[PDB]
Amino acid sequence: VSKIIDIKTSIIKIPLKRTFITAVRSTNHIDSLAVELTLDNGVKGYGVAPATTAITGDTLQGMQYIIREIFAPVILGSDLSDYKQTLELAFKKVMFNSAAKMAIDLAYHDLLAKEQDISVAKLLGAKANSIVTDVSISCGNVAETIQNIQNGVEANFTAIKVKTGADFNRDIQLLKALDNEFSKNIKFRFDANQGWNLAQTKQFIEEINKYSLNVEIIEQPVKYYDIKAMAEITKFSNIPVVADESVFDAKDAERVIDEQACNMINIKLAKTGGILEAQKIKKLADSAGISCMVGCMMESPAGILATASFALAEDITVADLDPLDWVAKDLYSDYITFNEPNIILKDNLKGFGFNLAENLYF
Amino acid sequence: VSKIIDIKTSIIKIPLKRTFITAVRSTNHIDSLAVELTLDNGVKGYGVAPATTAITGDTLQGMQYIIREIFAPVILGSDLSDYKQTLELAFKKVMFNSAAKMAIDLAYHDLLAKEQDISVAKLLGAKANSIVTDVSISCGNVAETIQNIQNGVEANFTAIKVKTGADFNRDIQLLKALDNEFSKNIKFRFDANQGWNLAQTKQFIEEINKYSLNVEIIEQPVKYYDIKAMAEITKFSNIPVVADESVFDAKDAERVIDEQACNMINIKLAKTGGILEAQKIKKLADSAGISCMVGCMMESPAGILATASFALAEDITVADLDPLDWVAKDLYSDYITFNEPNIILKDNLKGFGFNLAENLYFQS
Ligand SMILES: O=C(O)/C=C/C(=O)O
Numbered sequence: 001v002s003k004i005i006d007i008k009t010s011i012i013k014i015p016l017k018r019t020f021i022t023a024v025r026s027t028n029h030i031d032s033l034a035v036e037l038t039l040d041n042g043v044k045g046y047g048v049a050p051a052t053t054a055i056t057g058d059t060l061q062g063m064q065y066i067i068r069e070i071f072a073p074v075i076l077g078s079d080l081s082d083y084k085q086t087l088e089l090a091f092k093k094v095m096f097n098s099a100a101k102m103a104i105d106l107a108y109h110d111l112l113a114k115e116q117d118i119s120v121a122k123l124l125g126a127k128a129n130s131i132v133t134d135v136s137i138s139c140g141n142v143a144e145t146i147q148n149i150q151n152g153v154e155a156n157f158t159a160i161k162v163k164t165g166a167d168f169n170r171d172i173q174l175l176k177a178l179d180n181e182f183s184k185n186i187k188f189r190f191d192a193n194q195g196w197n198l199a200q201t202k203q204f205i206e207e208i209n210k211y212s213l214n215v216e217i218i219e220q221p222v223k224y225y226d227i228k229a230m231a232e233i234t235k236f237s238n239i240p241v242v243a244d245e246s247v248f249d250a251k252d253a254e255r256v257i258d259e260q261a262c263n264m265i266n267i268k269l270a271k272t273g274g275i276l277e278a279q280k281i282k283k284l285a286d287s288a289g290i291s292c293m294v295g296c297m298m299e300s301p302a303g304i305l306a307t308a309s310f311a312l313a314e315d316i317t318v319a320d321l322d323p324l325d326w327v328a329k330d331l332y333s334d335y336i337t338f339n340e341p342n343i344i345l346k347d348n349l350k351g352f353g354f355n356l357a358e359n360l361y362f
Numbered sequence: 363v364s365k366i367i368d369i370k371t372s373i374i375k376i377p378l379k380r381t382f383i384t385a386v387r388s389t390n391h392i393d394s395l396a397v398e399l400t401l402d403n404g405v406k407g408y409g410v411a412p413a414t415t416a417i418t419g420d421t422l423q424g425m426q427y428i429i430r431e432i433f434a435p436v437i438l439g440s441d442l443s444d445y446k447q448t449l450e451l452a453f454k455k456v457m458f459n460s461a462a463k464m465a466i467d468l469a470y471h472d473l474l475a476k477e478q479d480i481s482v483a484k485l486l487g488a489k490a491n492s493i494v495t496d497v498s499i500s501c502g503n504v505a506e507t508i509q510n511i512q513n514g515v516e517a518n519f520t521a522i523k524v525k526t527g528a529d530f531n532r533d534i535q536l537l538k539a540l541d542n543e544f545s546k547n548i549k550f551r552f553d554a555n556q557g558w559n560l561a562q563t564k565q566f567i568e569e570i571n572k573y574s575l576n577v578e579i580i581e582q583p584v585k586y587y588d589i590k591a592m593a594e595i596t597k598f599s600n601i602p603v604v605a606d607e608s609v610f611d612a613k614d615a616e617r618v619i620d621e622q623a624c625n626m627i628n629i630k631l632a633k634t635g636g637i638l639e640a641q642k643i644k645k646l647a648d649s650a651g652i653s654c655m656v657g658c659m660m661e662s663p664a665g666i667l668a669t670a671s672f673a674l675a676e677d678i679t680v681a682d683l684d685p686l687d688w689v690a691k692d693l694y695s696d697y698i699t700f701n702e703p704n705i706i707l708k709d710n711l712k713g714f715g716f717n718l719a720e721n722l723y724f725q726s
């Protein structure tokens with residue numbers, strides 16, 4: 001039987017086509033750690049995860065140490081077929097650092113798929129190859145935001161993720177401008193990234209209802225830990241409420257289900273620590289009648305591919321996967337065609353379908 | 363008006379005299395990161411935090427990067443007196459990594475006290491200089507466990523923290539041996555490190571009550587996130603239930619208070635990310651009528667001194683501060699008198715008094 005006999009890691013930095021600015025940070029590149037697992041039959045698997053320290057607490061340096069010194073001793077010499085057990089044993093030695101776990105989990109799935117000579121998407125049960133993404137619009141003044149949205153529509157996106165929560169007055173006034181400039185064929189997804197309080201959230205919802213807008217979701221309006229407010233907003237709202245930072249893992253999902261704190265969960269592999277835990281969330285959500293979407297960090301097209309593979313296998317059609325729009329096409333053109341707004345997996349790939357040759361070998 | 367003009371770090375590795383084993387992990391050593399903040403008047407201040415990856419997720423490598431590349435740009439050039447808003451802005455850039463935050467928070471407190479020519483304990487409002495600690499006992503077979511406790515008793519410890527949760531059958535059998543070997547002048551504290559399930563915890567508490575033992579606390583019997591079981595256990599138990607891993611920060615404290623999920627919170631600076639957040643927890647607990655104790659990771663004496671200084675200032679008298687007993691005396695004797703089981707702060711130290719630059723080479 002196949003055993004994992006080697007583990008390597010590599011830091012990969014990808015340039016962005018434009019400056020990416022968040023509440024805490026500004027950057028021109030993506031930081032990623034890649035891991036390579038080698039079987040004793042020569043087959044190599046790969047996984048790639050972002051270090052988004054502000055969200056998951058991961059750092060490249062921490063991930064590298066965790067994988068080399070903590071996970072590796074558990075993994076080396078183990079049978080591939082025992083992966084579920086090996087991963088449970090390995091991950092229980094580390095609190096948090098979900099992105100480090102993601103990299104390992106993905107590499108394992110790459111191995112499992114390659115051993116069957118299929119794609120990871122196929123391994124996971126996917127049939128369809130294509131998923132629609134929104135385009136993500138950064139915070140800004142009303143004028144430039146309206147323009148950014150217009151560029152998105154002209155680029156063929158009909159689903160628009162509008163970031164809010166930085167300036168509440170701006171968020172409210174934006175609604176008037178949206179109602180004037182756009183019809184109901186454009187659908188909006190707001191993500192406040194924890195920036196609103198309870199009263200503000202209610203106001204924003206009421207304000208939406210004063211206009212005629214197609215608004216699909218209100219995402220993470222309040223602090224990740226204020227589950228009471230999330231439940232109250234979910235009850236108050238006529239628009240589906242999405243838990244993002246409130247849900248990393250299956251036990252977080254259990255809490256928001258128990259407390260009725262959202263209508264939909266935004267699953268991100270960098271939060272879940274990869275595909276196994278993401279599957280557990282989807283299963284819990286299905287049982288509870290809670291819908292799921294998929295999302296990502298500003299991260300490698302490799303992570304996007306893994307996420308799209310998971311969503312296609314899980315019948316998740318709502319996706320915020322835009323980072324492909326931020327990087328050079330030739331980075332992903334071997335495994336993905338992005339014909340906006342469609343992310344389309346290429347045919348006949350083995351495993352995920354990307355290799356690290358340039359980073360690891362050249 | 364003093365301004366922070368440099369930030370440097372050094373790794374510290376310390377060997378343990380004996381093996382530390384809990385339900386979560388086993389180790390013979392402590393890995394820590396020390397940070398040094400330099401003021402423009404030349405005064406330096408220090409903090410030290412453990413990398414206990416299985417508990418706080420911190421690593422030496424992540425801590426180094428966070429402190430030098432993430433926190434440092436926010437801190438460098440800032441006025442010392444701006445510490446509260448500087449730490450708030452810096453800490454917002456990093457989710458988790460509470461031990462990295464502890465190191466920086468402690469270094470700031472060292473500076474604050476030094477600038478007033480007093481000890482940190484004095485800065486925080488302490489009156490007393492002495493706190494009593496238990497000694498903790500590694501998971502192991504019954505015979506070796508009894509021997510370790512006997513060692514502790516002969517060393518003058520009367521409060522004994524017994525690690526459980528690794529082997530439940532052993533845990534139950536041990537109670538019989540304790541009852542046979544020790545009087546009620548010995549006070550036991552059980553800590554399962556999350557290792558039991560709900561049914562086991564109830565059975566253990568029932569078993570305790572079949573014997574004659576002086577049992578002070580049952581600590582974190584179940585998973586950190588099973589707040590429902592913690593509440594059920596708290597309501598079932600005649601013994602105070604302590605939340606440890608269930609409470610890192612003030613918002614965790616609010617949750618366990620709201621859900622009646624413990625009788626007491628074990629405050630650790632490596633979980634809170636330092637003194638400022640630990641003070642917020644204590645205040646919430648006081649308002650809720652919930653008691654606090656202080657605890658630690660298996661960590662350097664520098665973290666122990668910082669924690670004792672906080673406890674003394676907050677009128678916290680219940681302490682699991684034992685790592686001094688696991689390491690060479692000469693590591694702490696500059697700043698602490700440990701007349702077991704009493705941790706006594708030395709007189710007339712400025713700031714904490716760690717004296718780290720003497721033994722460590724700090725680099726930016
Ligand atoms: O593993 C440690 O460092 C400490 C654990 C505890 O005392 O709870």
Ligand SMILES: [Mg+2]
Nearest residue numbers: 191219220244
């Ligand atoms: Mg979001």
